[PDB]
Design a binder for this molecule. Sequence first.
Ligand SMILES: [Ca+2]
Lengths: 100, 277, 9
Amino acid sequence: MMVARPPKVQVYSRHPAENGKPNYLNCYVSGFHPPQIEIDLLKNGEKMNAEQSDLSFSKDWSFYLLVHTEFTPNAVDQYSCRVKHVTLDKPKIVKWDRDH
Amino acid sequence: MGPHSLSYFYTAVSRPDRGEPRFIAVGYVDDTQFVRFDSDAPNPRMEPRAPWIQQEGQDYWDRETQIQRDNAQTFRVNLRTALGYYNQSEAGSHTFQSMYGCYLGPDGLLLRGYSQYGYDSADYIALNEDLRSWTAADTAAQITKRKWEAADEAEQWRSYLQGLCVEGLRRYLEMGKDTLQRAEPPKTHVTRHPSSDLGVTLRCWALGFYPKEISLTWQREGQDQSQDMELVETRPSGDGTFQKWAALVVPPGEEQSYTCHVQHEGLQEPLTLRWDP
Amino acid sequence: IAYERMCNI
Ligand SMILES: [Ca+2]
């Protein structure tokens, strides 16, 4: 079976962001198949230590995962989420911004 | 607050010339995950993933653990059987999934139930609404339908859904009442983001809500603006609640002509909001 | 409470 569904990626904070205030950074990856995937939160381009949810799926059978960790936003550091999957000919990178 | 449900989600994946398949199970009451099983864990067991299930004694953990170890073996057999039905080689990874559950009526008895199976991200076989019959998605699944009819497997499902399933659901709802029987309404606000002389983005946010079901829409004096509205997928907050937003581009100076409308089961009335700096 | 005896396809 040749089905291969590309992932949707959202990068966002738990609470509205404010500089110098401890918060949580989330990378939600959904709608994908097959289930093999690599999801990395990045800080200034380097992998962060992050926790990953147990594999689950939706009514259409497609899979989803949450990758998350603590962070304290500021005006200097850059954050993003990098995803690798059979449907992606180069990694998908989504930048975090406080307006989405 | 709508009818409560108990549901389970199983996934097995084949890893060829690389060992036996992996089996993961998760259990939910409504949108709250309360248990997990992972065939790769040392002495793998059904584990708690919510605080209110820890109360349950050792007899509950042992029984739930044994059932998941048997499922893992059954799904390994299923993956083998499916290669024969679809004439597939030994070379590729394949996926076998199940999702099933029950809903509780206002009378404290079964309202409705379901039991579905999927192979390689496609429908395979499903229990019908009447809990007395099956729907096969293709000619391979028809083989399974004939086998399960011969075994009257539907009767075994119906007796579970009516009895043990709703028995467990009532127990979980009482044990975790402080969280499971409480809808958390959304905290809402509207942000504005300039873009060009032709448009300004207005974004309507809904934060910290439970359960996940919600309605977010924009209107311009009575008429829905869904056509070119950006509506992101409902996403987890990380603490058990959910988030969502809906955005549209409007001409500069006409921001007060647009209103955001929010419906959720935790709200006594629907909400209306606007850009209000 | 999970369903107790799943049947092979
Ligand atoms: Ca139109």
